[PDB]
Amino acid sequence: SDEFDALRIKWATLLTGGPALDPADSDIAARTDKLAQDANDYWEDMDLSSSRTYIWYALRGNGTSDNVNAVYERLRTMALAATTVGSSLYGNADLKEDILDALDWLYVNSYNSTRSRSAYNWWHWQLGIPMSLNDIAVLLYDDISAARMATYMDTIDYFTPSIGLTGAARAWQAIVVGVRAVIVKDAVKLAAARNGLSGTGIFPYATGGDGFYADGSFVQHTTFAYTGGYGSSVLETTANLMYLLSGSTWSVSDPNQSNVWQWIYEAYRPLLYKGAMMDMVRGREISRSYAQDHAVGHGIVASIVRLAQFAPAPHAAAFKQIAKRVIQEDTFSSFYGDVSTDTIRLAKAIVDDPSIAPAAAPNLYKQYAAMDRAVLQRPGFALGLALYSTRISSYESINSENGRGWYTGAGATYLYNQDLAQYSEDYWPTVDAYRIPGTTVASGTPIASGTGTSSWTGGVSLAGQYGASGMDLSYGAYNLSARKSWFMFDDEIVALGSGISSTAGIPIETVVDNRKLNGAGDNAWTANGAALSTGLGVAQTLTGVNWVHLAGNTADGSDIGYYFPGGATLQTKREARTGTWKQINNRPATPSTAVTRNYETMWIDHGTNPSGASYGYVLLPNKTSAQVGAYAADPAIEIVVNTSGVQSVKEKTLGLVGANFWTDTTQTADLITSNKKASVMTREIADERLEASVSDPTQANNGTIAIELARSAEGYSADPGITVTQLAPTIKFTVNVNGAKGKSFHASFQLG
Ligand SMILES: C[C@]1(C(=O)O)OC[C@H]2O[C@@H](O)[C@@H](O)[C@@H](O)[C@@H]2O1
Numbered sequence: 001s002d003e004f005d006a007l008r009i010k011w012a013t014l015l016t017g018g019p020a021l022d023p024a025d026s027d028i029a030a031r032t033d034k035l036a037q038d039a040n041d042y043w044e045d046m047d048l049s050s051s052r053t054y055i056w057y058a059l060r061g062n063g064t065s066d067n068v069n070a071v072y073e074r075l076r077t078m079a080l081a082a083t084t085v086g087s088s089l090y091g092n093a094d095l096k097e098d099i100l101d102a103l104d105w106l107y108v109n110s111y112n113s114t115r116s117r118s119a120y121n122w123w124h125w126q127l128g129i130p131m132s133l134n135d136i137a138v139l140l141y142d143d144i145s146a147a148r149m150a151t152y153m154d155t156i157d158y159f160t161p162s163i164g165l166t167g168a169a170r171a172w173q174a175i176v177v178g179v180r181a182v183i184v185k186d187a188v189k190l191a192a193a194r195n196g197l198s199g200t201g202i203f204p205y206a207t208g209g210d211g212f213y214a215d216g217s218f219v220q221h222t223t224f225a226y227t228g229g230y231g232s233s234v235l236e237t238t239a240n241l242m243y244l245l246s247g248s249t250w251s252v253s254d255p256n257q258s259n260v261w262q263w264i265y266e267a268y269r270p271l272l273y274k275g276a277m278m279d280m281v282r283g284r285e286i287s288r289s290y291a292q293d294h295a296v297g298h299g300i301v302a303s304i305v306r307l308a309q310f311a312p313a314p315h316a317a318a319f320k321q322i323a324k325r326v327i328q329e330d331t332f333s334s335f336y337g338d339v340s341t342d343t344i345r346l347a348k349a350i351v352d353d354p355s356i357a358p359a360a361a362p363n364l365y366k367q368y369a370a371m372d373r374a375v376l377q378r379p380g381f382a383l384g385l386a387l388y389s390t391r392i393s394s395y396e397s398i399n400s401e402n403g404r405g406w407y408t409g410a411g412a413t414y415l416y417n418q419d420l421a422q423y424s425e426d427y428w429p430t431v432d433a434y435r436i437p438g439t440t441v442a443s444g445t446p447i448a449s450g451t452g453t454s455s456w457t458g459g460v461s462l463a464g465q466y467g468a469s470g471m472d473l474s475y476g477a478y479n480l481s482a483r484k485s486w487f488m489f490d491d492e493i494v495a496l497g498s499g500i501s502s503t504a505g506i507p508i509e510t511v512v513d514n515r516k517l518n519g520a521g522d523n524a525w526t527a528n529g530a531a532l533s534t535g536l537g538v539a540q541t542l543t544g545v546n547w548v549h550l551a552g553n554t555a556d557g558s559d560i561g562y563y564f565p566g567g568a569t570l571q572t573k574r575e576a577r578t579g580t581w582k583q584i585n586n587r588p589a590t591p592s593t594a595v596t597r598n599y600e601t602m603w604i605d606h607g608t609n610p611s612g613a614s615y616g617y618v619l620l621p622n623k624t625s626a627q628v629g630a631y632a633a634d635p636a637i638e639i640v641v642n643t644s645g646v647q648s649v650k651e652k653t654l655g656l657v658g659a660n661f662w663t664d665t666t667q668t669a670d671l672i673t674s675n676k677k678a679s680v681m682t683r684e685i686a687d688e689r690l691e692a693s694v695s696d697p698t699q700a701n702n703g704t705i706a707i708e709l710a711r712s713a714e715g716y717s718a719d720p721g722i723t724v725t726q727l728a729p730t731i732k733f734t735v736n737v738n739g740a741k742g743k744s745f746h747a748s749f750q751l752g
Contacts, residue, residue, distance in 0.1 A: 017341035027336035039081030062110035065124035072132035167201025216266035217370035225371035275330030284402035321359035332420035365467035369742030389457030404433035413438030418557030458697025460679035468658035499644030500613035521598030561620030561628035718747030
């Protein structure tokens with residue numbers, strides 16, 4: 001035996017769970033039964049005639065890459081059922097032969113060197129199919145003749161002989177070349193797969209274009225926030241290949257591999273909430289029924305479990321703690337229910353180890369400047385904010401997927417609480433795509449997929465604890481402008497809108513919220529202390545509203561309060577909406593089955609052709625109706641300013657003042673004065689200190705931002721980049737933002 005045999009067996013275990021796969025495990029037995037179950041269904045529906053024109057009638061079409069890819073996926077599942085200890089199909093000779101005969105037929109009539117490598121969909125021909133075929137070849141290695149293996153492997157080499165792409169594509173090429181190299185025992189190709197991870201979009205941090213960024217962001221296809229979509233793929237592929245190679249002659253040695261650990265801590269951890277990977281970073285994948293947020297989150301945790309198997313200290317331990325936490329957290333969908341058998345084996349080892357304690361939940365405010373995203377994580381809830389600009393596109397829609405993703409990244413707010421199923425359970429095909437929470441739009445009117453013309457999109461982070469974001473709105477599809485800001489405190493998220501103007505001749509509205517309700521659609525809700533009707537199919541306008549409370553889908557932890565400073569007129573409706581995933585994902589594999597979900601939708605009618613309209617509301621997670629009414633009697637936030645020039649909010653209890661300055665002119669908001677476009681947040685601790693953080697969201701100021709704070713200081717300390725010129729009678733300093741790429745600069749002033 002040689003080292004290649006060792007690697008092949010190591011990969012085989014990654015696929016089957018290995019020989020130690022304990023069948024006495026509830027979730028394992030449950031997964032192995034599901035596996036054998038699916039295998040029999042396929043094997044039973046196979047056309048085994050020697051004159052067949054397809055393997056499965058439903059997937060016929062030797063030239064349809066979608067179907068061909070699915071055919072190989074089914075064969076992979078069947079191979080798994082025949083090689084997974086515990087499966088009732090383990091070692092079945094007939095099943096194995098039927099699979100290999102299927103591969104031979106597919107080789108002669110569909111997947112071979114006579115087909116173009118670039119025919120649609122290239123991804124299937126060069127990456128999808130080879131990944132499935134490689135796995136089958138490893139699983140049934142001992143039953144595959146030299147003649148057969150040659151047709152399988154020679155074909156893969158034709159479609160993908162080398163690694164030359166970037167990001168996820170490059171990572172996929174690497175795993176295709178790598179696993180095949182193990183099968184055929186080519187040390188040259190294997191070393192190439194290893195080196196492949198050092199390339200663009202993988203190990204090295206991106207500073208533009210595709211890849212992981214130092215600030216935690218992940219971009220793919222040049223202008224799309226994609227941590228949970230293509231990012232998840234780069235993570236999974238990288239983790240698997242690194243694990244396969246670890247300890248071997250081809251173990252990864254590139255020092256930049258340490259960046260992978262940071263992906264987990266900075267790119268993923270802040271974007272996961274009780275098992276769900278936030279949709280705002282999943283791109284067009286939000287339109288995939290088989291990839292709803294928790295399904296995606298499980299895959300990410302599966303990768304973390306994989307990394308925990310070979311990562312160096314103290315990362316392996318940390319990853320185990322993170323995985324343990326998320327597994328315990330997800331009471332919506334069992335983590336073990338949709339991950340590989342080996343992942344289950346490895347995960348159970350972590351969960352069952354009493355010496356491993358679940359990691360602490362993330363608690364912070366993070367600005368993902370490189371992908372126009374922001375997140376707030378707190379006990380009991382998380383808020384994700386999705387924006388776009390001249391640097392990041394509104395949404396991606398290709399290959400007939402996500403055709404209604406219009407406003408999913410246009411000032412959209414996503415609130416995560418104990419209703420873990422909020423964005424799953426067919427939310428995407430039923431929600432009104434024209435009314436994404438937090439957005440301002442021309443009613444029932446779409447926008448195009450693309451970057452905007454405004455550079456002011458971003459925000460400021462105050463010591464990674466609190467923050468503020470903003471987006472200068474300007475759609476290309478129709479006339480509509482506005483300044484939109486969000487201020488994130490402890491349990492209050494203040495949304496402000498100003499300068500809302502349009503000549504489009506279409507009613508303009510701002511969506512306060514749009515929440516999926518319970519099955520009966522009877523969630524209790526109140527306004528100004530009075531109970532509101534809970535019936536479905538009812539539209540009603542609320543005038544002079546100070547506050548609204550909406551009971552959640554869970555007994556506790558999912559209520560949401562809404563406070564309206566100065567009062568507001570709210571348009572609302574409660575309805576059952578029906579749709580199909582096919583409507584937002586027009587692919588043959590997509591189910592056309594109708595699904596119905598209930599919603600409570602609330603928005604503000606700015607009218608047609610508004611001029612300088614505005615809005616202001618406060619999201620209050622986890623407060624009872626009584627508590628929202630109490631809040632309204634003494635609101636903890638105060639709107640300092642809400643003009644087209646500056647939007648500012650103060651949270652007296654925390655001593656916080658946030659301010660977004662929209663123009664390059666000297667303006668003042670409370671104690672803060674700025675001479676240019678900037679996002680600023682200060683925290684004052686009476687007679688103790690005054691903290692200040694500043695950023696240039698435009699990422700285009702080649703000089704500085706001059707700030708003046710109306711307080712007298714005794715001394716200071718600050719990030720390099722900040723130059724303090726005065727401490728008394730008032731504080732004055734400049735922030736060098738040349739090439740800052742939207743980062744925040746912090747200073748601490750001693751008061752006195
Ligand atoms: C299996 C599948 C899919 O349909 O989900 O095939 C198409 C692939 O397209 C890539 O661009 C990724 O989205 C990648 O995730 C996709 O995987």
